[PDB]
């Protein structure tokens, strides 16, 4: 009855809006007015205004929808979205965000803004700069709504990810500033988005992000410790991988700044139970190829005696074996000779692992076998003079 | 449950940019240790660089198609504004030059069909001589 007519009613708006000739196509008519110089600017503004109403109306129906009518609206919505450029769309939709009083409609508007840019290039650099200023300005206003907050954080992540460098610096530095504050947000959704931005922001800024270094690494280490305790969070795995993947991002961009806090970095990799071994083992390969090995060798001894030796965790021990072994074939002869006393000191601790190990014989035997082959590698690549005292 | 999907997707996307090869988000202990050690070497041999190339190319194709779609669509749109301007005498300097180029473009093309002058010099000699006899007209 009423619904059947509405099913038929939205078939119209699809049919007319569907882009099946110059004169039939609505989308083409718009562009000619925009391309045409003598077209009145007031007329252009009406096109922008009429569209904000048109886009809002379709979103209102979709928000307040019935499966067959739901899909037709997306056909209508899809036809709507392609009517006008990215240029005029952003102008006509950005000032609708603040005006819109429904959290749903605002939620929907942010999503569409991104997909306009998912297939754009360098031509949108001036426009995106306008968008970033607006989205940043909306952040304090929409802190109350997690979903709106989460998505808008995600949007900058795509846009900082894509041609973020071309963006004007103050936005980047500003965007990094907002993210660091939002890392402390109690909502796990706000956090994971916050970490992701800083990765992309630090990825672009690089050394220039050092000013924020006190505000990223020390909190992140603290967040991981809280992450272990609150095992009941449904998003624990996503939260953990973000923290590890945060270090992984900066392990390629600021190795040596992170050299001092590398010990905490390794601590995260070891005891990140939720994250897969491949991810944890992968980021390890980044550390060796990016951070100087001598400092790692110094660190491996301290972590082993402190936590791993008493950890009684198979994954932590295995990955420590992977890290320690990985260093030795890659460490230089000069570094090996210089760092020999620490390695042998660690080696004695490794040999004594059987005394305190709570694992069965088979594991300890296998662990020793790994301990021996690496030791053979380390004693090789050295000279008599350094070794004779050590022997 | 939207948050779950959104949370996964942001994590899912970021994994690819930094760690392409690693899979995405969706017994005796001695066995576990060895498997991890075996995992270390195989992932080290993974051709991650090839993986990055494929993702770049797939995205590059998609953007290229849309840029062509924008280019073709605008070129069509650029024509009508000329048509309406030409019909209404709203030609600017630019339109009066592009059409002038078209006047040149077509005119040069028809010259190739129109054939060269030197053959005309001889062809006309053959032409007139055919005509005079068949028409006759001396009487």
């Amino acid at each position: 009855e009423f619904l059947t007519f509405m099913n038929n009613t939205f078939e119209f708006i699809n049919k007319i809006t569907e882009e099946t000739d110059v004169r039939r196509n609505l989308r083409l008519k718009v562009y000619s007015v925009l391309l045409d110089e003598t077209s009145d600017k007031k007329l252009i503004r009406n096109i922008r205004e009429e569209f904000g109403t048109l886009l809002e109306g379709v979103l209102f129906f979709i928000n307040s929808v019935t499966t067959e009518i739901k899909e037709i609206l997306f056909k209508v919505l899809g036809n709507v979205l392609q009517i006008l450029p990215v240029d005029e769309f952003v102008n006509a939709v950005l000032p609708l965000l603040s005006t819109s009083t429904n959290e749903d409609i605002r939620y929907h508007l942010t999503l569409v803004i991104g997909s306009k840019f998912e297939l754009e290039g360098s031509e949108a650099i001036p426009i995106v700069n306008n968008v970033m200023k607006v989205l940043l300005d909306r952040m304090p206003l929409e802190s109350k709504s997690v979903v709106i907050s989460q998505v808008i954080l995600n949007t900058m992540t795509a846009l900082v990810s894509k041609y973020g460098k071309k963006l004007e610096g103050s936005i980047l530095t500003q965007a990094l500033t907002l993210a660091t504050e939002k890392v402390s947000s109690d909502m796990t959704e706000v956090k994971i988005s916050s970490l992701a931005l800083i990765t992309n922001c630090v990825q672009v800024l690089g050394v220039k992000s050092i000013a924020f270094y006190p505000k990223i690494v020390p909190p992140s280490i603290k967040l991981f410790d809280a992450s272990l305790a609150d095992s009941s969070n449904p998003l624990k795995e996503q939260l953990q991988v973000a923290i590890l993947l945060l270090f992984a991002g900066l392990i390629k961009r600021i190795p040596s700044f992170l050299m001092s806090n590398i010990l905490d970095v390794l601590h995260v990799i070891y005891f990140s139970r939720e994250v897969d071994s491949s991810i944890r083992l992968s980021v390890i390969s980044l550390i060796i190829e990016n951070i100087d090995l001598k400092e790692v060798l110094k660190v491996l001894f301290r972590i082993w005696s402190t936590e791993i030796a008493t950890s009684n965790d198979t994954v932590a021990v295995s990955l420590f074996l992977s890290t320690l072994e990985s260093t030795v074939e890659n460490i230089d002869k000069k570094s090996a000779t210089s760092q020999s006393p620490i390695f042998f000191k660690l080696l004695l601790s490794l040999f004594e692992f059987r005394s305190i190990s709570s694992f069965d014989n088979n594991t300890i035997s296998r662990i020793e076998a790994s301990v021996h082959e690496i030791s053979n590698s380390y004693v090789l690549k050295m000279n008599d003079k350094v070794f004779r005292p050590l022997f | 449950q939207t948050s779950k999907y959104q949370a996964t997707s942001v994590v899912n996307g970021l994994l690819s940019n930094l760690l392409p090869g690693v899979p995405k988000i969706r017994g005796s202990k001695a066995q576990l240790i060895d498997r991890n050690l075996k995992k270390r070497v195989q992932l080290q041999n993974r051709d991650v660089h090839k993986i990055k190339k494929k993702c770049k190319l797939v995205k590059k194709k998609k953007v290229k198609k849309h840029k062509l779609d924008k280019e073709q669509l605008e070129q069509l749109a650029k024509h009508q504004v000329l048509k309406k301007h030409q019909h209404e005498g709203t030609l600017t300097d630019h339109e009066r030059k592009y059409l002038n180029k078209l006047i040149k473009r077509n005119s040069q093309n028809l010259r190739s069909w129109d054939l060269e002058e030197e053959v005309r010099d001889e062809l006309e000699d053959i032409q007139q001589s055919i005509l005079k006899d068949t028409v006759s007209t001396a009487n």
């Binding site: 979709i62 929808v65 739901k70 749903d104 999503l111 569409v112 997909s115 | -």
Partner: peptide, 24 residues
């Protein structure tokens, strides 16, 4: 003829997000 017969036989992301939002 049946022996011939057997031989013959032998030879949008936002829309997802929008829909996902309607679910909750």
């Amino acid at each position: 003829k049946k022996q011939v017969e057997q031989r013959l036989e032998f030879y949008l992301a936002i829309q997802e997000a929008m829909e996902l939002y309607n679910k909750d």
